Amino acid sequence: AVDTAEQVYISSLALLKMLKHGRAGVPMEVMGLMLGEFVDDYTVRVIDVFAMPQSGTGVSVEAVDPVFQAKMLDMLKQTGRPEMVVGWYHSHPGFGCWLSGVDINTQQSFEALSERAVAVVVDPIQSVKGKVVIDAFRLINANMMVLGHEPRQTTSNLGHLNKPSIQALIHGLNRHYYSITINYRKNELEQKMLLNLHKKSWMEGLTLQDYSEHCKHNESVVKEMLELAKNYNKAVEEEDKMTPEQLAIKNVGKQDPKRHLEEHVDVLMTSNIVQCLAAMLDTVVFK
Amino acid sequence: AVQKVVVHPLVLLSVVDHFNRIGKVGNQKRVVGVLLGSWQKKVLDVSNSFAVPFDEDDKDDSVWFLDHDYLENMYGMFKKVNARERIVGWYHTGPKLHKNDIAINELMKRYCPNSVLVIIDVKPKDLGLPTEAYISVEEVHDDGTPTSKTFEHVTSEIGAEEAEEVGVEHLLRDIKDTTVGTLSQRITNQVHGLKGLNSKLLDIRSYLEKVATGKLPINHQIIYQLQDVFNLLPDVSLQEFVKAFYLKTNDQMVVVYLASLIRSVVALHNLINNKIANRDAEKKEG
Amino acid sequence: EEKFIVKATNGPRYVVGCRRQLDKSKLKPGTRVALDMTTLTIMRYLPRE
Amino acid sequence: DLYSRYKKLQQELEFLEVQEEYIKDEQKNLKKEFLHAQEEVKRIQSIPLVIGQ
Ligand SMILES: [Zn+2]
């Protein structure tokens, strides 16, 4: 009878494998297996994550082929992957990320070997592309109903765990069903390689190709955006001619939610491209 | 045949995994990975890939170790779980193009279709684009050299379709989007000179070195087109472009009128509220 | 011209975009088309009968 | 007290002068976060949607 403060380490490997697995996450029930290494009691690290072939039965203990699982794990052991399995993941599209009776039964059957049994459910179908915040699931002991539910120390991270604060699943099904916090980790190779790779993904090949395209399109295509921009500017000034009457009568309170200022500032920002690229044309013409 | 290709960062982060699971053994050689993609459509799209045990020799370069059973098993299981992607080629992390690559690529030329080759760097110090698509096709040479495997550079782009942009943007939380305006433009206008300076300056040194101290003909025929394109701009006197400078300068005047006039419109609420608010707050404060 | 309104058979209406493969030939209104569950893209049209 | 107000006041000169580059950092960074969060809440609005009444 002892419990500690565990935290699931999530790198970019399992994240991207859950993003591609989420793209291939058909409404049919899918299967997955997570790997890693156990260094101590209250920490867990995942490194290897792969997918499993779909079946008509779906998420079940019968669909897990022991000769296929042990075969692929042996093929990973003969290679440079000396990590044991740490859990299994899946997707719950539509009906919510909660776990049914079959999922908790195969979880109870699959947790006999690993005491942790990390469970992660990705659902990018109804999740907006703004946030990709994911949550990890855990299994509580049925004999702990008499004592405290979760005697876990370090209650500070619960504020970070309160971000998924849906009012139906967390305390709608919190009985015998809790969760755990999730953190990330990034070394210098992922920071410089992935940062420079993303900056290059938003940059050009030689970085000097598409500059003259806009520098010379300022005289052909942008002129239409400047004339239309002046058409919207006049379309606002026609009301700005009527503004000094009300502003000259009431001067108390604001009724129009439009600011009429930041939009013109943005128009000036779009207009400053000519000024910023004029020096570019000066450098291309000069040398 | 193929004009452009699409390479997702998932395979390069899989190379980051290749550099992660080394184990500090001290080898860090050119680990060859089996590149996967969609060869059906004219454009090439890499989704994911895997690895194969590859080991070379110290002295002899012609030594190469591949595996057919592991490739057919990973391709069989991966095709069973996802039949939308098949084998296309391979890729090595070595920064130098060795002669053994014709024998390494020749296997996937016989068994597999035309394989694309990608050379990257083991250290993320190269400012340029790390991915270069090199098609394995035989070209006829004019000087009379025998027909051999030629690696023609195919342009490449780094883009994500649906989710990898969200995952990368969430993991970074430091990079910025397009954000057209002052900073995203002036940063490019400041550092672009170094972006071309390190590449061109880094190339003209080995170029001028191999001009005088070079042997083993490197197809000097293309150098005539090199210096020819370099001489396609023979220091124009800018006489005819004066009117174009008058047009661009006239657009500059338009931007001046828009700035002065629009900012003059913005000064209304500030230069009015500063008075009517201060005088009323002062006369009504006490 | 790039984004138009669609009418599903079930009754609820939606709006979709334009795919880079297709052109504006079949994109004109008055022709029954098909949609996808993911991203609501357009694969091809559906001729009435 | 009379002559000590100069040298004692210099501490307030440095403590108030040091805030210049600080408020520069805040006014130059909080607008970058303003456009970050602004584009983050702006990109939520997607083209595929349902039309009600
Ligand atoms: Zn279901």
Side-chain angles (χ1 to χ4, degrees), chain B residues 45-56:
Chain B
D45 188 75
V46 170
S47 296
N48 198 1
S49 293
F50 60 92
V52 57
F54 181 78
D55 286 328
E56 289 180 353

Side-chain angles (χ1 to χ4, degrees), chain A residues 10-13 15-17 19-20 23-24 26 45 47 51-54 68 71-72 75-76 78-81 83 128-133 184 186-187 189-208 211 215 218-219 223 226 230 233 237 240 243 247 251 259-261 264-265 267-285 287, chain B residues 9-10 12-14 16-17 19-21 47-48 53 69-70 73-74 77-78 80-82 84 121-131 158-178 180-183 185-189 192-193 195-196 199 233 235 238 241 244-245 247-248 251-252 254-256 258-259 261-263 265-270 272 276:
Chain A
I10 296 298
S11 66
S12 180
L13 291 168
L15 193 142
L16 290 177
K17 291 303 292 293
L19 289 179
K20 184 178 73 69
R23 178 65 178 171
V26 297
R45 182 178 182 270
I47 172 166
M52 292 296 291
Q54 292 85 17
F68 184 77
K71 181 175 173 66
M72 185 180 287
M75 295 177 73
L76 292 174
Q78 68 182 357
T79 58
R81 295 288 181 90
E83 289 87 6
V128 75
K129 65 183 177 67
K131 60 183 181 293
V132 71
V133 176
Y184 290 161
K186 285 171 70 176
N187 55 3
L189 205 150
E190 181 182 358
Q191 189 69 40
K192 294 186 287 184
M193 185 66 204
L194 197 145
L195 191 143
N196 197 3
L197 182 58
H198 196 193
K199 289 290 289 183
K200 182 60 69 177
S201 178
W202 283 98
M203 206 64 72
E204 311 170 3
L206 198 136
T207 66
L208 295 174
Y211 287 171
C215 293
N218 289 319
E219 298 178 354
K223 282 190 179 181
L226 292 174
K230 291 187 285 184
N233 287 318
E237 289 179 354
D240 291 331
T243 53
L247 293 174
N251 274 313
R259 65 268 184 102
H260 295 285
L261 296 175
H264 293 88
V265 172
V267 173
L268 295 177
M269 296 301 291
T270 61
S271 179
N272 287 318
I273 302 170
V274 175
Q275 291 182 354
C276 294
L277 294 184
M280 296 298 291
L281 287 175
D282 290 331
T283 56
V284 174
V285 167
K287 290 299 291 186
Chain B
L10 183 59
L12 293 175
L13 194 138
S14 179
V16 176
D17 186 74
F19 292 160
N20 194 1
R21 68 180 188 271
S47 296
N48 198 1
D69 196 2
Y70 189 77
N73 287 318
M74 289 294 106
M77 296 177 184
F78 183 76
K80 182 175 73 175
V81 67
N82 192 0
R84 295 178 179 91
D121 195 1
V122 292
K123 269 76 176 175
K125 294 181 176 67
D126 194 1
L127 192 143
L129 208 152
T131 301
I158 303 299
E161 197 266 326
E162 181 68 28
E164 193 173 4
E165 285 179 354
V166 179
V168 166
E169 185 178 1
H170 179 74
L171 288 172
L172 284 173
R173 283 287 184 265
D174 198 3
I175 199 169
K176 196 176 284 189
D177 292 331
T178 302
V180 179
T182 172
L183 55 96
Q185 193 172 4
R186 74 175 181 261
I187 288 169
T188 61
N189 299 131
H192 80 90
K195 291 185 172 69
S199 179
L233 186 63
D235 291 331
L238 271 301
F241 207 76
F245 281 162
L247 192 144
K248 181 65 167 61
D251 291 331
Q252 176 59 255
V254 175
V255 179
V256 170
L258 290 174
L261 268 65
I262 288 299
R263 289 291 291 166
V265 175
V266 178
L268 188 142
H269 294 88
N270 289 318
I272 287 173
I276 60 98

Side-chain angles (χ1 to χ4, degrees), chain B residues 21-243:
Chain B
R21 68 180 188 271
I22 294 172
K24 301 284 103 175
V25 293
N27 205 4
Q28 59 266 13
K29 285 193 289 186
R30 47 182 61 247
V31 176
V32 168
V34 177
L35 186 63
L36 298 172
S38 179
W39 192 254
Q40 183 178 2
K41 198 180 286 185
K42 186 182 286 185
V43 65
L44 191 143
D45 188 75
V46 170
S47 296
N48 198 1
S49 293
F50 60 92
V52 57
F54 181 78
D55 286 328
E56 289 180 353
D57 195 1
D58 194 1
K59 292 182 181 179
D60 191 75
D61 200 5
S62 296
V63 173
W64 56 272
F65 292 157
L66 291 177
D67 193 355
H68 293 282
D69 196 2
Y70 189 77
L71 193 144
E72 292 292 327
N73 287 318
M74 289 294 106
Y75 177 71
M77 296 177 184
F78 183 76
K79 186 175 174 66
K80 182 175 73 175
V81 67
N82 192 0
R84 295 178 179 91
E85 189 176 5
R86 72 265 188 99
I87 45 95
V88 52
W90 62 277
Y91 63 94
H92 63 87
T93 188
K96 298 292 183 182
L97 185 67
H98 285 89
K99 189 176 180 180
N100 202 5
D101 289 329
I102 189 168
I104 299 166
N105 200 3
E106 188 65 30
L107 187 143
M108 290 184 184
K109 186 177 180 180
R110 297 190 305 271
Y111 292 99
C112 300
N114 46 0
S115 296
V116 64
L117 196 144
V118 174
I119 293 171
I120 60 171
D121 195 1
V122 292
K123 269 76 176 175
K125 294 181 176 67
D126 194 1
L127 192 143
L129 208 152
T131 301
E132 287 89 0
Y134 294 158
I135 190 166
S136 177
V137 293
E138 292 179 353
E139 294 179 353
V140 175
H141 201 273
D142 199 3
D143 201 5
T145 62
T147 300
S148 179
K149 189 178 287 184
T150 303
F151 289 161
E152 184 178 1
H153 174 71
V154 178
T155 182
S156 178
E157 64 183 1
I158 303 299
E161 197 266 326
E162 181 68 28
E164 193 173 4
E165 285 179 354
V166 179
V168 166
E169 185 178 1
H170 179 74
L171 288 172
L172 284 173
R173 283 287 184 265
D174 198 3
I175 199 169
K176 196 176 284 189
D177 292 331
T178 302
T179 66
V180 179
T182 172
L183 55 96
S184 296
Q185 193 172 4
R186 74 175 181 261
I187 288 169
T188 61
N189 299 131
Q190 285 178 357
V191 195
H192 80 90
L194 193 144
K195 291 185 172 69
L197 182 62
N198 59 2
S199 179
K200 187 173 181 179
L201 181 63
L202 193 142
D203 288 330
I204 60 169
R205 292 291 183 268
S206 179
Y207 178 76
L208 267 69
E209 182 67 28
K210 296 303 290 182
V211 163
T213 63
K215 61 178 73 67
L216 271 73
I218 54 176
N219 194 1
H220 185 79
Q221 183 66 42
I222 199 66
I223 294 175
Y224 299 103
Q225 187 176 2
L226 181 143
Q227 189 180 1
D228 199 357
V229 172
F230 283 170
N231 286 118
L232 284 178
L233 186 63
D235 291 331
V236 181
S237 296
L238 271 301
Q239 296 294 321
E240 186 68 28
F241 207 76
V242 173
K243 186 67 174 67

Side-chain angles (χ1 to χ4, degrees), chain A residues 74 78 82 86 95 99 102 108 160 229 239 268:
Chain A
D74 186 74
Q78 68 182 357
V86 299
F95 61 93
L99 295 173
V102 180
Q108 176 61 253
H160 296 284
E239 196 271 332
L268 295 177

Side-chain angles (χ1 to χ4, degrees), chain C residues 6-46:
Chain C
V6 298
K7 293 290 290 183
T9 307
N10 199 3
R13 65 180 67 88
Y14 296 99
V15 287
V16 301
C18 182
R19 193 167 185 263
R20 64 178 176 87
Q21 183 62 255
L22 57 94
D23 291 331
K24 273 76 177 175
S25 179
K26 68 182 179 67
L27 197 139
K28 63 177 72 175
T31 300
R32 189 175 181 88
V33 297
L35 302 177
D36 193 1
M37 63 179 288
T38 61
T39 325
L40 289 176
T41 189
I42 301 168
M43 295 296 172
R44 63 184 182 271
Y45 67 95
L46 183 62

